[PDB]
Amino acid sequence: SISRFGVNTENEDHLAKELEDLNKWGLNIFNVAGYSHNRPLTCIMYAIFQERDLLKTFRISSDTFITYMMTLEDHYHSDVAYHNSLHAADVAQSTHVLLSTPALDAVFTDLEILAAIFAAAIHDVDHPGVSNQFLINTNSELALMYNDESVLENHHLAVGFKLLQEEHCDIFMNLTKKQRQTLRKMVIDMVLATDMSKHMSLLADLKTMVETKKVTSSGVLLLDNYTDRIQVLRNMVHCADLSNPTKSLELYRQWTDRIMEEFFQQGDKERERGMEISPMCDKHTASVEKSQVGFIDYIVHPLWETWADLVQPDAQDILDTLEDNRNWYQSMIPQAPA
Ligand SMILES: Nc1ncnc2c1nc(Br)n2[C@@H]1O[C@H](COP(=O)(O)O)[C@@H](O)[C@H]1O
Ligand SMILES: [Zn+2]
Ligand SMILES: [Zn+2]
């Protein structure tokens, strides 16, 4: 309902043009936010749920959905440069595209599709713009509550679900009790998996699976048991979360400026509070280009090559873009050795 969005017909027409890419990696979520009064997460999520008939399937009225989404989106901090609703919207939409990869056709149930997109939407909700370590080092009440383990990730989950109890926000009201239980389990699993400290083990397990990889006569992947599906789902959301470098350079560069500003912001907070300045959080000693190249080589590329392997040749264009983007940054590195 365009009215809940406060969008007039002219921006609705702009939005319509942007949403033509709803199912494409090339969608520009920045333009989406620009035409939706900066409610990219609710807009994109509504478009996604309509596109996949998830509202009909799970009996979620547009009212309940929009109410919950606008509430959730409002719990993302618009003053946090990277981990805001724009990033959540990007990850939800990226997850939406990844779910429809040829190699995974007919593999996931609707509840699993619902879980993955929900997970993506709430995975960074109420993010303060600082790392778990910063929260730990400052003796944050949040760190004490979660015993220094996956502090933010646990909090993102607690908030995403807690907001279902606000007025007209229970979008899972009509799922059976078993459905809610299963979705909760899967969502918790996928969001906890976004904790970068679990990356290596996620990748390790992911490779170990690409080995026993099974397909059909048409090439479609075969995932018959839960453990395997959830493992693919958790890695999928992780990949979407780490998809910035695989996007058109125009987009990637905007994501990089944001993550760097957020790091510098934390750097400022550490200086303000008399703490030692963390790595990559000092704008006067950080190498943006070197960082990206290093991030891609050791984290992003190793992840996406493995995902591309699992669903080959579906992710080939993504891998090519990733590699082009990496080399572009490697060339932009300030002309050393002098
Ligand atoms: N261009 C980029 N996009 C996403 N994360 C990046 C990044 N460059 C770097 Br360095 N990172 C790091 O990778 C982590 C990924 O976690 P999130 O995507 O959830 O933010 C970031 O928190 C940040 O520490
Ligand atoms: Zn996160
Ligand atoms: Zn994220």
mmCIF file of C-alpha atoms and ligand atoms in Angstrom:
data_model
loop_
_atom_site.group_PDB
_atom_site.id
_atom_site.type_symbol
_atom_site.label_atom_id
_atom_site.label_comp_id
_atom_site.label_asym_id
_atom_site.label_seq_id
_atom_site.Cartn_x
_atom_site.Cartn_y
_atom_site.Cartn_z
ATOM 1 C CA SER A 1 0.000 0.000 0.000
ATOM 2 C CA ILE A 2 1.785 3.026 -1.428
ATOM 3 C CA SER A 3 -0.029 5.215 1.127
ATOM 4 C CA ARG A 4 1.626 3.666 4.190
ATOM 5 C CA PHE A 5 4.848 4.483 2.320
ATOM 6 C CA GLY A 6 3.880 8.132 1.901
ATOM 7 C CA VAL A 7 5.016 7.915 -1.722
ATOM 8 C CA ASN A 8 3.260 9.940 -4.424
ATOM 9 C CA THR A 9 2.623 8.713 -7.966
ATOM 10 C CA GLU A 10 5.773 10.331 -9.366
ATOM 11 C CA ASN A 11 8.161 8.533 -7.021
ATOM 12 C CA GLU A 12 5.971 5.459 -7.308
ATOM 13 C CA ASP A 13 6.718 5.589 -11.030
ATOM 14 C CA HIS A 14 10.451 6.021 -10.286
ATOM 15 C CA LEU A 15 10.235 3.101 -7.898
ATOM 16 C CA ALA A 16 8.449 0.986 -10.478
ATOM 17 C CA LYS A 17 11.356 1.568 -12.830
ATOM 18 C CA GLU A 18 13.901 0.628 -10.159
ATOM 19 C CA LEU A 19 11.992 -2.478 -9.085
ATOM 20 C CA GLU A 20 12.211 -3.879 -12.627
ATOM 21 C CA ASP A 21 15.517 -5.211 -11.298
ATOM 22 C CA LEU A 22 13.946 -6.746 -8.194
ATOM 23 C CA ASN A 23 15.243 -10.186 -9.143
ATOM 24 C CA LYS A 24 18.588 -8.927 -10.441
ATOM 25 C CA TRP A 25 22.023 -8.557 -8.811
ATOM 26 C CA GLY A 26 22.153 -5.170 -10.514
ATOM 27 C CA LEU A 27 19.252 -3.713 -8.529
ATOM 28 C CA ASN A 28 20.269 -0.331 -7.086
ATOM 29 C CA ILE A 29 19.059 -0.261 -3.479
ATOM 30 C CA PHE A 30 20.382 3.308 -3.076
ATOM 31 C CA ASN A 31 17.895 4.552 -5.688
ATOM 32 C CA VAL A 32 15.184 2.481 -4.013
ATOM 33 C CA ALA A 33 15.819 4.229 -0.688
ATOM 34 C CA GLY A 34 15.863 7.524 -2.550
ATOM 35 C CA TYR A 35 12.323 7.048 -3.869
ATOM 36 C CA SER A 36 10.808 5.509 -0.751
ATOM 37 C CA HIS A 37 11.429 8.178 1.901
ATOM 38 C CA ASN A 38 14.431 6.127 2.959
ATOM 39 C CA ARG A 39 12.466 3.011 3.817
ATOM 40 C CA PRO A 40 14.429 0.672 1.482
ATOM 41 C CA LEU A 41 14.095 -2.327 3.757
ATOM 42 C CA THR A 42 10.301 -2.172 3.996
ATOM 43 C CA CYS A 43 9.918 -1.301 0.318
ATOM 44 C CA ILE A 44 12.206 -4.045 -0.948
ATOM 45 C CA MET A 45 10.813 -6.569 1.520
ATOM 46 C CA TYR A 46 7.241 -5.790 0.484
ATOM 47 C CA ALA A 47 8.242 -6.143 -3.178
ATOM 48 C CA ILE A 48 9.987 -9.429 -2.408
ATOM 49 C CA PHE A 49 7.090 -10.904 -0.456
ATOM 50 C CA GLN A 50 4.609 -9.948 -3.194
ATOM 51 C CA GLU A 51 6.912 -11.305 -5.891
ATOM 52 C CA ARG A 52 7.141 -14.630 -4.029
ATOM 53 C CA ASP A 53 3.506 -14.635 -2.872
ATOM 54 C CA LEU A 54 4.784 -15.162 0.666
ATOM 55 C CA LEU A 55 1.996 -12.960 2.048
ATOM 56 C CA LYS A 56 -0.642 -15.218 0.482
ATOM 57 C CA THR A 57 1.173 -18.425 1.395
ATOM 58 C CA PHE A 58 1.595 -17.565 5.069
ATOM 59 C CA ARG A 59 -1.536 -15.490 5.443
ATOM 60 C CA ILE A 60 0.287 -12.309 6.313
ATOM 61 C CA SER A 61 -1.905 -9.292 5.659
ATOM 62 C CA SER A 62 -0.263 -6.282 4.025
ATOM 63 C CA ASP A 63 -1.187 -4.338 7.148
ATOM 64 C CA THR A 64 0.654 -6.628 9.564
ATOM 65 C CA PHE A 65 3.619 -6.973 7.203
ATOM 66 C CA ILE A 66 4.110 -3.243 6.591
ATOM 67 C CA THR A 67 3.540 -2.438 10.263
ATOM 68 C CA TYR A 68 6.171 -4.946 11.408
ATOM 69 C CA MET A 69 8.645 -4.053 8.653
ATOM 70 C CA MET A 70 8.404 -0.296 9.284
ATOM 71 C CA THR A 71 8.904 -0.983 13.002
ATOM 72 C CA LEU A 72 11.889 -3.265 12.351
ATOM 73 C CA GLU A 73 13.415 -0.820 9.870
ATOM 74 C CA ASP A 74 13.056 1.913 12.447
ATOM 75 C CA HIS A 75 15.198 -0.082 14.845
ATOM 76 C CA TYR A 76 18.129 0.098 12.411
ATOM 77 C CA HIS A 77 20.176 3.250 13.162
ATOM 78 C CA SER A 78 20.074 5.723 10.300
ATOM 79 C CA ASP A 79 23.162 7.477 11.693
ATOM 80 C CA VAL A 80 25.308 4.324 11.588
ATOM 81 C CA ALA A 81 27.040 4.647 8.192
ATOM 82 C CA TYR A 82 27.026 1.011 7.049
ATOM 83 C CA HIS A 83 25.018 -1.234 9.347
ATOM 84 C CA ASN A 84 21.716 0.559 8.755
ATOM 85 C CA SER A 85 18.452 -0.463 6.999
ATOM 86 C CA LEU A 86 19.994 0.174 3.593
ATOM 87 C CA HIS A 87 22.483 -2.628 4.258
ATOM 88 C CA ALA A 88 19.741 -4.917 5.599
ATOM 89 C CA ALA A 89 17.626 -4.165 2.508
ATOM 90 C CA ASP A 90 20.599 -4.933 0.268
ATOM 91 C CA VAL A 91 21.221 -8.218 2.040
ATOM 92 C CA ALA A 92 17.547 -9.212 1.940
ATOM 93 C CA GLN A 93 17.310 -8.503 -1.797
ATOM 94 C CA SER A 94 20.633 -10.233 -2.491
ATOM 95 C CA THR A 95 19.371 -13.257 -0.573
ATOM 96 C CA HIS A 96 16.191 -13.055 -2.666
ATOM 97 C CA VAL A 97 18.200 -13.304 -5.880
ATOM 98 C CA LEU A 98 20.455 -16.077 -4.523
ATOM 99 C CA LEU A 99 17.415 -18.145 -3.525
ATOM 100 C CA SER A 100 16.298 -18.238 -7.169
ATOM 101 C CA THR A 101 19.625 -19.461 -8.509
ATOM 102 C CA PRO A 102 18.961 -22.219 -11.110
ATOM 103 C CA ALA A 103 21.108 -24.685 -9.158
ATOM 104 C CA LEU A 104 18.757 -24.385 -6.155
ATOM 105 C CA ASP A 105 15.411 -24.521 -7.952
ATOM 106 C CA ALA A 106 12.674 -26.389 -6.043
ATOM 107 C CA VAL A 107 15.165 -27.222 -3.287
ATOM 108 C CA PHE A 108 13.734 -25.082 -0.475
ATOM 109 C CA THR A 109 10.274 -25.141 1.082
ATOM 110 C CA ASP A 110 8.378 -21.841 1.370
ATOM 111 C CA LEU A 111 9.049 -21.689 5.100
ATOM 112 C CA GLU A 112 12.778 -21.964 4.440
ATOM 113 C CA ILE A 113 12.497 -19.205 1.842
ATOM 114 C CA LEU A 114 10.590 -17.113 4.379
ATOM 115 C CA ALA A 115 13.188 -17.837 7.062
ATOM 116 C CA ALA A 116 16.165 -16.873 4.881
ATOM 117 C CA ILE A 117 14.723 -13.546 3.768
ATOM 118 C CA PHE A 118 13.494 -12.732 7.277
ATOM 119 C CA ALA A 119 16.919 -13.611 8.705
ATOM 120 C CA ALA A 120 18.541 -11.314 6.157
ATOM 121 C CA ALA A 121 16.138 -8.464 6.989
ATOM 122 C CA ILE A 122 16.673 -8.579 10.752
ATOM 123 C CA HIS A 123 20.320 -9.725 10.883
ATOM 124 C CA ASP A 124 21.798 -6.326 11.849
ATOM 125 C CA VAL A 125 18.828 -4.676 13.547
ATOM 126 C CA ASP A 126 19.717 -2.194 16.295
ATOM 127 C CA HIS A 127 23.403 -2.359 15.339
ATOM 128 C CA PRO A 128 25.256 0.428 17.255
ATOM 129 C CA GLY A 129 27.926 0.958 14.635
ATOM 130 C CA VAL A 130 30.659 -0.687 16.720
ATOM 131 C CA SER A 131 32.073 -4.207 16.887
ATOM 132 C CA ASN A 132 31.433 -6.881 19.481
ATOM 133 C CA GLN A 133 34.961 -6.323 20.802
ATOM 134 C CA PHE A 134 34.271 -2.637 21.382
ATOM 135 C CA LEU A 135 31.180 -3.635 23.388
ATOM 136 C CA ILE A 136 33.266 -6.150 25.294
ATOM 137 C CA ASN A 137 36.124 -3.739 26.016
ATOM 138 C CA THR A 138 33.817 -1.031 27.347
ATOM 139 C CA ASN A 139 32.031 -3.474 29.665
ATOM 140 C CA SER A 140 28.827 -2.873 27.712
ATOM 141 C CA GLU A 141 25.640 -4.109 29.369
ATOM 142 C CA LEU A 142 24.940 -6.032 26.144
ATOM 143 C CA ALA A 143 28.246 -7.935 26.361
ATOM 144 C CA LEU A 144 27.520 -8.828 29.978
ATOM 145 C CA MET A 145 24.082 -10.153 29.026
ATOM 146 C CA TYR A 146 25.433 -12.362 26.263
ATOM 147 C CA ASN A 147 28.653 -13.364 28.009
ATOM 148 C CA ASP A 148 30.834 -11.778 25.312
ATOM 149 C CA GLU A 149 29.671 -14.375 22.751
ATOM 150 C CA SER A 150 28.207 -13.219 19.424
ATOM 151 C CA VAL A 151 26.947 -10.203 21.317
ATOM 152 C CA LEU A 152 25.504 -8.178 18.461
ATOM 153 C CA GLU A 153 24.239 -11.187 16.519
ATOM 154 C CA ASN A 154 22.325 -12.467 19.557
ATOM 155 C CA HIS A 155 20.895 -8.977 20.081
ATOM 156 C CA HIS A 156 19.867 -8.630 16.430
ATOM 157 C CA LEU A 157 17.891 -11.855 16.821
ATOM 158 C CA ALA A 158 16.335 -10.856 20.137
ATOM 159 C CA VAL A 159 15.143 -7.553 18.689
ATOM 160 C CA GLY A 160 13.907 -8.936 15.376
ATOM 161 C CA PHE A 161 11.688 -11.441 17.181
ATOM 162 C CA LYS A 162 10.726 -9.198 20.105
ATOM 163 C CA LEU A 163 9.293 -6.609 17.703
ATOM 164 C CA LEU A 164 6.715 -9.198 16.565
ATOM 165 C CA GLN A 165 4.899 -8.514 19.833
ATOM 166 C CA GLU A 166 4.295 -4.836 19.147
ATOM 167 C CA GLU A 167 0.839 -3.711 17.972
ATOM 168 C CA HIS A 168 -0.166 -5.369 14.684
ATOM 169 C CA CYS A 169 3.360 -6.709 14.167
ATOM 170 C CA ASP A 170 3.036 -10.507 14.437
ATOM 171 C CA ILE A 171 3.698 -11.514 10.835
ATOM 172 C CA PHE A 172 4.024 -15.153 11.962
ATOM 173 C CA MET A 173 0.643 -15.230 13.713
ATOM 174 C CA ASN A 174 -0.834 -17.630 11.182
ATOM 175 C CA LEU A 175 2.030 -20.085 10.886
ATOM 176 C CA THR A 176 1.373 -23.338 12.752
ATOM 177 C CA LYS A 177 3.223 -23.769 16.037
ATOM 178 C CA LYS A 178 5.561 -26.236 14.341
ATOM 179 C CA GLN A 179 6.181 -23.770 11.513
ATOM 180 C CA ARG A 180 7.076 -20.968 13.941
ATOM 181 C CA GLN A 181 9.372 -23.333 15.834
ATOM 182 C CA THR A 182 11.154 -24.469 12.681
ATOM 183 C CA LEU A 183 11.476 -20.967 11.244
ATOM 184 C CA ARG A 184 12.792 -19.598 14.544
ATOM 185 C CA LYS A 185 15.440 -22.330 14.647
ATOM 186 C CA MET A 186 16.537 -21.619 11.086
ATOM 187 C CA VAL A 187 16.534 -17.833 11.547
ATOM 188 C CA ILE A 188 18.612 -18.045 14.723
ATOM 189 C CA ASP A 189 21.013 -20.368 12.919
ATOM 190 C CA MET A 190 21.419 -18.061 9.929
ATOM 191 C CA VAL A 191 21.870 -14.849 11.924
ATOM 192 C CA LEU A 192 24.367 -16.336 14.349
ATOM 193 C CA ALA A 193 26.220 -17.437 11.214
ATOM 194 C CA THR A 194 26.718 -13.787 10.249
ATOM 195 C CA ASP A 195 29.245 -13.427 13.082
ATOM 196 C CA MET A 196 32.512 -13.006 11.173
ATOM 197 C CA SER A 197 34.259 -15.060 13.846
ATOM 198 C CA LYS A 198 32.420 -18.083 12.428
ATOM 199 C CA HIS A 199 33.499 -17.398 8.844
ATOM 200 C CA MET A 200 36.348 -19.913 8.581
ATOM 201 C CA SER A 201 34.255 -22.726 10.034
ATOM 202 C CA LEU A 202 31.379 -21.802 7.708
ATOM 203 C CA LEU A 203 33.668 -21.899 4.684
ATOM 204 C CA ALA A 204 35.339 -25.100 5.857
ATOM 205 C CA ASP A 205 31.996 -26.838 6.301
ATOM 206 C CA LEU A 206 30.787 -25.355 2.998
ATOM 207 C CA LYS A 207 33.728 -26.811 1.074
ATOM 208 C CA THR A 208 33.391 -30.163 2.841
ATOM 209 C CA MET A 209 29.877 -30.164 1.404
ATOM 210 C CA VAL A 210 30.769 -29.150 -2.146
ATOM 211 C CA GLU A 211 32.771 -32.392 -2.094
ATOM 212 C CA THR A 212 29.808 -34.667 -1.363
ATOM 213 C CA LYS A 213 27.832 -32.371 -3.666
ATOM 214 C CA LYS A 214 24.942 -34.128 -5.427
ATOM 215 C CA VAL A 215 22.870 -33.057 -8.433
ATOM 216 C CA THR A 216 20.030 -34.249 -10.648
ATOM 217 C CA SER A 217 19.846 -35.219 -14.305
ATOM 218 C CA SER A 218 19.251 -31.530 -15.089
ATOM 219 C CA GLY A 219 22.131 -30.374 -12.889
ATOM 220 C CA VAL A 220 20.009 -29.089 -9.997
ATOM 221 C CA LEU A 221 21.537 -29.552 -6.546
ATOM 222 C CA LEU A 222 20.145 -32.281 -4.303
ATOM 223 C CA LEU A 223 19.620 -31.455 -0.633
ATOM 224 C CA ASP A 224 17.263 -34.008 0.892
ATOM 225 C CA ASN A 225 17.988 -33.595 4.617
ATOM 226 C CA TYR A 226 17.593 -30.592 6.933
ATOM 227 C CA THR A 227 21.204 -30.247 8.066
ATOM 228 C CA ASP A 228 22.344 -29.840 4.448
ATOM 229 C CA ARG A 229 19.657 -27.330 3.510
ATOM 230 C CA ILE A 230 20.243 -25.140 6.561
ATOM 231 C CA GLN A 231 23.980 -25.277 5.911
ATOM 232 C CA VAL A 232 23.346 -23.975 2.403
ATOM 233 C CA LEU A 233 20.936 -21.377 3.753
ATOM 234 C CA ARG A 234 23.292 -20.085 6.439
ATOM 235 C CA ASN A 235 26.093 -19.778 3.881
ATOM 236 C CA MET A 236 23.727 -18.058 1.439
ATOM 237 C CA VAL A 237 22.857 -15.284 3.903
ATOM 238 C CA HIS A 238 26.545 -14.982 4.797
ATOM 239 C CA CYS A 239 27.346 -14.591 1.100
ATOM 240 C CA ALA A 240 24.631 -11.933 0.666
ATOM 241 C CA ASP A 241 26.009 -10.182 3.719
ATOM 242 C CA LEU A 242 29.447 -10.317 2.043
ATOM 243 C CA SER A 243 28.153 -9.448 -1.422
ATOM 244 C CA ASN A 244 29.221 -5.785 -1.611
ATOM 245 C CA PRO A 245 32.443 -6.544 -3.565
ATOM 246 C CA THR A 246 30.500 -8.613 -6.115
ATOM 247 C CA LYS A 247 28.247 -5.731 -7.145
ATOM 248 C CA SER A 248 28.715 -3.211 -9.915
ATOM 249 C CA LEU A 249 31.671 -1.043 -8.924
ATOM 250 C CA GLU A 250 29.405 1.994 -8.664
ATOM 251 C CA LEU A 251 27.583 0.207 -5.843
ATOM 252 C CA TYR A 252 30.626 -1.453 -4.229
ATOM 253 C CA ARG A 253 32.362 1.894 -3.953
ATOM 254 C CA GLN A 254 29.382 3.337 -2.071
ATOM 255 C CA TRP A 255 29.349 0.345 0.270
ATOM 256 C CA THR A 256 33.106 0.745 0.897
ATOM 257 C CA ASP A 257 32.820 4.455 1.683
ATOM 258 C CA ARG A 258 30.139 3.502 4.212
ATOM 259 C CA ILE A 259 31.989 0.690 5.938
ATOM 260 C CA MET A 260 35.115 2.872 6.167
ATOM 261 C CA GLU A 261 33.162 5.776 7.624
ATOM 262 C CA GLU A 262 31.658 3.417 10.184
ATOM 263 C CA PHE A 263 35.147 2.159 11.084
ATOM 264 C CA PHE A 264 36.477 5.693 11.424
ATOM 265 C CA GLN A 265 33.444 6.484 13.562
ATOM 266 C CA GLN A 266 34.353 3.647 15.914
ATOM 267 C CA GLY A 267 37.940 4.859 15.788
ATOM 268 C CA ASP A 268 36.660 8.248 16.929
ATOM 269 C CA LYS A 269 34.737 6.641 19.796
ATOM 270 C CA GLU A 270 37.791 4.742 21.001
ATOM 271 C CA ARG A 271 39.875 7.922 20.959
ATOM 272 C CA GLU A 272 37.053 9.786 22.727
ATOM 273 C CA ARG A 273 36.917 7.172 25.473
ATOM 274 C CA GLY A 274 40.668 6.785 25.984
ATOM 275 C CA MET A 275 40.856 3.346 24.355
ATOM 276 C CA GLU A 276 43.516 2.121 21.922
ATOM 277 C CA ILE A 277 42.385 2.698 18.315
ATOM 278 C CA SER A 278 41.407 -0.560 16.586
ATOM 279 C CA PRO A 279 42.810 -1.685 13.193
ATOM 280 C CA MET A 280 41.217 -0.015 10.150
ATOM 281 C CA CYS A 281 39.451 2.450 12.468
ATOM 282 C CA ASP A 282 42.002 5.245 12.054
ATOM 283 C CA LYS A 283 41.393 7.320 8.905
ATOM 284 C CA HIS A 284 44.933 8.673 9.190
ATOM 285 C CA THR A 285 46.544 5.218 9.066
ATOM 286 C CA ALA A 286 44.060 3.085 7.121
ATOM 287 C CA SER A 287 44.638 1.887 3.559
ATOM 288 C CA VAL A 288 41.188 1.704 1.996
ATOM 289 C CA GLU A 289 42.446 0.113 -1.214
ATOM 290 C CA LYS A 290 44.822 -2.309 0.497
ATOM 291 C CA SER A 291 42.067 -3.288 2.923
ATOM 292 C CA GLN A 292 39.553 -4.141 0.231
ATOM 293 C CA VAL A 293 42.096 -6.130 -1.781
ATOM 294 C CA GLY A 294 43.036 -8.002 1.378
ATOM 295 C CA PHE A 295 39.406 -8.463 2.388
ATOM 296 C CA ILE A 296 38.544 -9.967 -0.982
ATOM 297 C CA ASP A 297 41.641 -12.185 -1.271
ATOM 298 C CA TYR A 298 41.385 -13.727 2.180
ATOM 299 C CA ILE A 299 37.656 -13.541 2.957
ATOM 300 C CA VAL A 300 35.238 -12.670 0.151
ATOM 301 C CA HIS A 301 36.814 -14.392 -2.846
ATOM 302 C CA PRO A 302 37.485 -17.638 -0.938
ATOM 303 C CA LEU A 303 33.814 -17.641 0.045
ATOM 304 C CA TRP A 304 32.286 -16.816 -3.334
ATOM 305 C CA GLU A 305 34.511 -19.174 -5.318
ATOM 306 C CA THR A 306 33.218 -21.962 -3.076
ATOM 307 C CA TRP A 307 29.614 -20.819 -3.460
ATOM 308 C CA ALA A 308 30.109 -20.491 -7.214
ATOM 309 C CA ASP A 309 31.421 -24.053 -7.146
ATOM 310 C CA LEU A 310 28.324 -25.299 -5.322
ATOM 311 C CA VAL A 311 25.964 -23.748 -7.884
ATOM 312 C CA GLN A 312 28.126 -23.582 -11.022
ATOM 313 C CA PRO A 313 27.840 -22.007 -13.450
ATOM 314 C CA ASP A 314 25.173 -19.766 -11.861
ATOM 315 C CA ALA A 315 27.595 -17.460 -10.006
ATOM 316 C CA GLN A 316 30.193 -17.038 -12.748
ATOM 317 C CA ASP A 317 29.286 -13.419 -13.555
ATOM 318 C CA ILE A 318 29.411 -12.577 -9.850
ATOM 319 C CA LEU A 319 32.903 -14.079 -9.561
ATOM 320 C CA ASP A 320 34.043 -12.147 -12.625
ATOM 321 C CA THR A 321 32.761 -8.879 -11.192
ATOM 322 C CA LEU A 322 34.385 -9.662 -7.853
ATOM 323 C CA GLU A 323 37.716 -10.238 -9.567
ATOM 324 C CA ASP A 324 37.432 -7.070 -11.655
ATOM 325 C CA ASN A 325 36.583 -5.061 -8.545
ATOM 326 C CA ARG A 326 39.558 -6.542 -6.690
ATOM 327 C CA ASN A 327 41.999 -5.631 -9.441
ATOM 328 C CA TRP A 328 40.518 -2.154 -9.691
ATOM 329 C CA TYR A 329 41.299 -1.522 -6.027
ATOM 330 C CA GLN A 330 44.721 -3.143 -6.331
ATOM 331 C CA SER A 331 45.440 -0.593 -9.044
ATOM 332 C CA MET A 332 44.065 2.298 -7.010
ATOM 333 C CA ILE A 333 46.486 1.564 -4.170
ATOM 334 C CA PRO A 334 48.463 4.818 -3.710
ATOM 335 C CA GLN A 335 51.529 4.673 -5.950
ATOM 336 C CA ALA A 336 54.230 3.225 -3.687
ATOM 337 C CA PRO A 337 57.097 2.499 -2.956
ATOM 338 C CA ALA A 338 57.477 6.265 -2.473
HETATM 339 N N1 LIG B 1 33.525 -3.620 1.472
HETATM 340 C C1 LIG B 1 33.168 -4.303 2.578
HETATM 341 N N2 LIG B 1 31.867 -4.774 2.637
HETATM 342 C C2 LIG B 1 31.470 -5.476 3.751
HETATM 343 N N3 LIG B 1 32.290 -5.741 4.814
HETATM 344 C C3 LIG B 1 33.591 -5.270 4.751
HETATM 345 C C4 LIG B 1 34.080 -4.528 3.624
HETATM 346 N N4 LIG B 1 35.405 -4.209 3.874
HETATM 347 C C5 LIG B 1 35.701 -4.732 5.087
HETATM 348 BR BR1 LIG B 1 37.429 -4.543 5.850
HETATM 349 N N5 LIG B 1 34.651 -5.388 5.676
HETATM 350 C C6 LIG B 1 34.585 -6.095 7.004
HETATM 351 O O1 LIG B 1 33.814 -7.301 6.892
HETATM 352 C C7 LIG B 1 32.830 -7.344 7.923
HETATM 353 C C8 LIG B 1 31.582 -8.011 7.334
HETATM 354 O O2 LIG B 1 30.478 -7.935 8.262
HETATM 355 P P1 LIG B 1 29.136 -7.252 7.808
HETATM 356 O O3 LIG B 1 28.898 -7.397 6.332
HETATM 357 O O4 LIG B 1 28.043 -7.845 8.498
HETATM 358 O O5 LIG B 1 29.230 -5.837 8.184
HETATM 359 C C9 LIG B 1 32.571 -5.880 8.221
HETATM 360 O O6 LIG B 1 31.983 -5.781 9.510
HETATM 361 C C10 LIG B 1 33.959 -5.284 8.145
HETATM 362 O O7 LIG B 1 34.642 -5.532 9.370
HETATM 363 ZN ZN ZN B 2 26.618 -8.126 11.436
HETATM 364 ZN ZN ZN B 3 25.274 -7.371 7.694
#
